Design a protein around this nucleic acid. Structure first.
Length: 224
DNA sequence: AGATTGCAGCACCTGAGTTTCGCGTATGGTCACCCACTACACTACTCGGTCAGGCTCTTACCAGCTTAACTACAGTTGATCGGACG
C-alpha cells in the first residue's frame, strides 16, 4: 500500500525461485488478475483476493534469464516470450488458448504494446525489430492461421568485428507464421541486442515508438 | 429467386518436434587362474682324513782291525755381575 508502506497487505510464496516479471490484466468486466513468470519457468495467473483458491498455470518454459511479459488491453490478452524464441498470446480467462504470434531465430528480449491499438512490437537479440497485429490472431478463426497472420521487420541492427560499425538496415522483410516451428538460439554481437521497446500511448503520439540496443543507440520513429 | 458461387463447418489421414530408445564403440571394473620369485629346511653324492693291510726298500751289522777324528787331562786371561756408588 503506497499510503501505508510499513507492512504489505499479504506475503505469500508463489514460485520456487526469482520472479522475473509480474503483469496486471485489468478489465471493466472481470477481476484484476495478475500473471507471474520466474526462473523455475512456470507462468501463473492468479487473483490477489485469494492466491491459494485461484492460482492457474498457462505453461512451463525452459528456465530463461530474461522473459518479457506485457498486457495488450485492447484484446484482454497477455503477450509473452516463451523464454526461447516465440511470441505467444494468452487470454486471461482461457489459459489453455495459447496462440503463437511470431517465430524468431534468436530470443525475444523486449516486447511493447499500447492502450490505444493492438500493435505489438518485439525485439530479438539478433538486433531485429518486428511489428505484428495481435488482434488479427485473437479475434478470428483458427483454420487458416498459418497463412492469414504475418509480421514485418521494421529495422535490423548489425555489427562487424573488424570494421566496428553499427549498421542499421532500413529494409523491410515479411515473415509468415511458422506454427510448428523449432526454438532457435543464434549467438550475436553483444551491443546489438534490443533492451527495451515501447509505443507512446497518447492520441497525438500514438504512432510514435522508441527502441534501444545495448550499446546505447536509442532510436525513435513516427509511423507516417 | 433461381443458377452460380463462397464461407466454413464436419470428418480422417498425416506430418514434424520431441521423445525414448538400441546399439556401436569403447571404456573402467569385477574376479578367477596360474605364473614368478623367493626361502627355510633337506636330501644325497662326492671328497677328504685316517686307519689297517702287507708288500716293499734299506739298513748295518759281532769281536777285531785299520782307516779316519776327536775328547778328556791341562793354563792366564776375559768382562758380566753383584751391589753399591752418583
Amino acid at each position: 500500500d503506497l499510503t501505508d508502506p510499513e507492512v504489505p497487505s499479504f506475503y505469500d510464496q508463489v514460485h520456487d525461485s526469482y520472479i522475473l516479471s509480474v503483469s496486471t490484466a485489468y478489465s471493466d468486466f472481470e477481476d484484476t488478475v495478475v500473471s507471474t513468470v520466474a526462473v523455475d519457468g512456470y507462468f501463473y495467473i492468479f487473483n490477489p483476493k485469494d492466491i491459494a483458491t485461484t492460482k492457474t498455470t498457462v505453461s512451463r518454459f525452459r528456465g530463461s534469464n530474461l522473459v518479457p511479459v506485457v498486457y495488450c488491453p485492447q484484446i484482454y490478452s497477455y503477450i509473452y516470450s516463451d523464454g526461447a524464441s516465440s511470441l505467444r498470446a494468452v487470454p486471461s480467462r482461457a489459459a489453455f488458448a495459447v496462440h503463437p504470434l511470431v517465430s524468431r531465430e534468436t530470443t525475444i528480449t523486449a516486447i511493447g504494446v499500447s492502450r490505444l491499438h493492438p500493435m505489438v512490437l518485439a525485439g530479438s537479440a539478433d538486433g531485429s525489430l518486428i511489428i505484428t497485429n495481435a488482434a488479427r490472431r485473437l479475434l478470428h478463426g483458427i483454420k487458416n492461421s498459418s497463412a492469414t497472420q504475418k509480421s514485418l521487420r521494421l529495422w535490423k541492427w548489425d555489427y562487424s568485428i573488424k570494421d566496428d560499425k553499427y549498421r542499421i538496415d532500413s529494409s523491410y522483410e515479411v515473415y509468415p507464421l511458422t506454427v510448428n516451428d523449432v526454438s532457435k538460439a543464434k549467438i550475436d554481437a553483444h551491443g546489438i541486442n534490443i533492451t527495451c521497446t515501447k509505443w507512446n500511448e497518447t492520441s497525438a503520439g500514438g504512432k510514435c515508438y522508441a527502441f534501444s540496443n545495448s550499446a546505447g543507440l536509442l532510436t525513435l520513429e513516427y509511423l507516417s
